[PDB]
C-alpha cells in the first residue's frame, strides 16, 4: 500500500533530548507514543522503496526467436537420449517420434485414454508422475499451490473432437493443439526435450505449420526453418577421417617431469 | 552532475508523476470486454454487415499521404442524387451519409458513385413484413443468405 507506515504524524523532537533523531509519535497516553515511524529501521514505518505496482512485470521476445525456440523444442522431442535425460521413463515405447492413429481424437471416456497409454507403453510416465505427489516445501502451501508433481507425456492433436475430455483426469498429461504450440509446455523449466505423443492428423500438418527447409511455411506469413551453424554436428568422425589425420603434426606425449638439479 | 560525454537529457519527471500513473493491467481483460460487445452486437442485428454500414472511397489530405485512399466518414450528398438514393433513406439501408463533403472533382465522384451502384446490386433487402411489396428482394435470394460480412464491406484496397 501507498500508506504503509505513512499515516502517523511523527515529528522527531531531536538533538538535545538524548534519544535518536527518529520521527517519533506525537503526544498520547499509549505505548505508541515516542516510538519511531517513517523509518525502514523501526517497527511500523515502511520498507525500503515500497514495492510499486508499475514494476516492469512482463517481458518480450522477438517473433522469430520464440518461433525457433519451438523448433529446437520439437527437434529434441525426438532423440531419446535428450528425452530420457529429462526423466520421462521411455524405455518400452516402440518409437520416439511416437505417432498414433486419429481414432484418439474421438475418444470420450478416460477409460480408453488410459487404455491407449498402456498399449503404447506410456503408462510408466504417469506411473512416475503418480509417485511424485507430495506437499510443496515452503510457504507456498498456504497460498493455493499446495501439491506438486512431475510433468507427464504431452499429447498433440489437430482438432478437439472430444480427446481433451478423455485425457483430462490423467495427471501430468497436457493437451497441446498443433496450430497453438507453446514453449512453456513443450519444454518446461527451460530444459529441453519433453515426451510428446502426436496423432497422425497433427503429425502431417507440422511441416505445413512452420515449414520444411526448401519450402515456405504456407501457414505462417513468412518463415522457414533456421539454418545450421554446422552440419556434421559430430566431430568424432571428423577428427579421424583420412583428410584430417593425414595433415597433422605427430603428437607429443612424453610428459617431462622436472629434473632435480644435482 | 554530468560526466564525460553523455547526452543532455531533459526528462519530464519534475512535476509529480507517481500519483497519475496509469498501469495497463486491464489491457488483456479489455480485449475481452470489447470482444463480447463486437460479438453481442453482431448477434443482435443478425442479418447485417457486422462491420457496419458502407463507407465511401476518399483521398487523404496532405501531400505526404497524397496517393493513399481511405474509408471515408460517409457518402456525400452530391454523390447521392446521381445514384438516386434519397438522403434520409440511405441512413436506413446501411449507407453512411455525410452531409458535409464538398465535391471538387468528377474523378472521385464517379469512382465513389460506383460503390453505391455496386452496393445496390449485391444488397438483399428483407422486406418490411413477411408478406410484403416491391423492392424487397425475392424469397430465393432471401433463403440463400444470413451472412454477416465479417470485416469491412467491400474493403477499399489501395
Amino acid at each position: 500500500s501507498e500508506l504503509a507506515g505513512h499515516q502517523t504524524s511523527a515529528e522527531s523532537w531531536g538533538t538535545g533530548r538524548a534519544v535518536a533523531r527518529i520521527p517519533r509519535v506525537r503526544g498520547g497516553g499509549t505505548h505508541r507514543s515516542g516510538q519511531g515511524a517513517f523509518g525502514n529501521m523501526c517497527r511500523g514505518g515502511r520498507m525500503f522503496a515500497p514495492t510499486k505496482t508499475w514494476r516492469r512485470w512482463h517481458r518480450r521476445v522477438n517473433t522469430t526467436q520464440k518461433r525457433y525456440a519451438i523448433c529446437s523444442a520439437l527437434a529434441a522431442s525426438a532423440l531419446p537420449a535428450l528425452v530420457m535425460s529429462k526423466g520421462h521413463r521411455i524405455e518400452e515405447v516402440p518409437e520416439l517420434p511416437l505417432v498414433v492413429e486419429d481414432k484418439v481424437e474421438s475418444y470420450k471416456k478416460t477409460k480408453e485414454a488410459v487404455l491407449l497409454l498402456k498399449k503404447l507403453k506410456a503408462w510408466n510416465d504417469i506411473k512416475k508422475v503418480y509417485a511424485s505427489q507430495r506437499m510443496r516445501a515452503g510457504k507456498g502451501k498456504m497460498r493455493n499451490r499446495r501439491r506438486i508433481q512431475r510433468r507427464g507425456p504431452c499429447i498433440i492433436y489437430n482438432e478437439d473432437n472430444g480427446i481433451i475430455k478423455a485425457f483430462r483426469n490423467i495427471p501430468g498429461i497436457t493437451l497441446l493443439n498443433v496450430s497453438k504450440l507453446n514453449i512453456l509446455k513443450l519444454a518446461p523449466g527451460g530444459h529441453v526435450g519433453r515426451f510428446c505423443i502426436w496423432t497422425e492428423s497433427a503429425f502431417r500438418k507440422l511441416d505445413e505449420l512452420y515449414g520444411t527447409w526448401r519450402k515456405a511455411a504456407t501457414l505462417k506469413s513468412n518463415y522457414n526453418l533456421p539454418m545450421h551453424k554446422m552440419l556434421n554436428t559430430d566431430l568424432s568422425r571428423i577428427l579421424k577421417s583420412p583428410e584430417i589425420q593425414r595433415a597433422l603434426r605427430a603428437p607429443r606425449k612424453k610428459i617431462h617431469r622436472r629434473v632435480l638439479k644435482k | 552532475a554530468p560526466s564525460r560525454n553523455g547526452m543532455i537529457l531533459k526528462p519530464h519527471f519534475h512535476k509529480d508523476w507517481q500519483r497519475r500513473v496509469a498501469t495497463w493491467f486491464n489491457q488483456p481483460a479489455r480485449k475481452i470486454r470489447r470482444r463480447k460487445a463486437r460479438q453481442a452486437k453482431a448477434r443482435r442485428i443478425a442479418p447485417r454487415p457486422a462491420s457496419g454500414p458502407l463507407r465511401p472511397v476518399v483521398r487523404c489530405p496532405t501531400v505526404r499521404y497524397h496517393t493513399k485512399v481511405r474509408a471515408g466518414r460517409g457518402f456525400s450528398l452530391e454523390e447521392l442524387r446521381v445514384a438516386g438514393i434519397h438522403k434520409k433513406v440511405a441512413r436506413t439501408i446501411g449507407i453512411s451519409v455525410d452531409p458535409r463533403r464538398r465535391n471538387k472533382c468528377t474523378e472521385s465522384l464517379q469512382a465513389n458513385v460506383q460503390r453505391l451502384k455496386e452496393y445496390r446490386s449485391k444488397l438483399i433487402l428483407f422486406p418490411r413484413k413477411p408478406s410484403a411489396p416491391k423492392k424487397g428482394d425475392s424469397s430465393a435470394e432471401e433463403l440463400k443468405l444470413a451472412t454477416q460480412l465479417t470485416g469491412p464491406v467491400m474493403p477499399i484496397r489501395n
Partner: protein, 134 residues
Amino acid sequence: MKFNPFVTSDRSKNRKRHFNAPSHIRRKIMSSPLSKELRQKYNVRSMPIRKDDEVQVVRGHYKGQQIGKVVQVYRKKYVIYIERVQREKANGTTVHVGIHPSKVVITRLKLDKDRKKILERKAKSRQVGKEKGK
C-alpha cells in the same frame, strides 16, 4: 480440475465457509454414509445424520461393531454424540465423546415424511444421471 468461475477453491476462503457456516448448511456437511445393506435398498450413498439414527463407529480409538443410537448433534461443536460412545471423567461422571459423522456409518435410518422425500429425490437423481449417460 474445477472449471466454473464463481467457485472459490481457495485454501483459506472455504475454511472460512466452514467455521462460519450457518446451522442450515451444517446439516449437509454433517452427513454420514449408509451401510452396504441400506445403500443397496434405497440407492442412496449418504445421508445427513439425524438425532435418533443408529450408527456404527468405523474409525477412532473405539471403532467397533456395536450399534448405538445417536443422542444429539453439536452442530456448534460440529460433531455428534452417540449411545455408549462415552468415557469416564475424574469424578466417575461419564460424558459423551464427539464423533464426526464422516467417520461413522448409518445402519438404520429414522424414517419420516421429510426423510422419505429426501431418499426418493436422492435416488431419482442418481438414476437420472445414469439414464442421461446411457
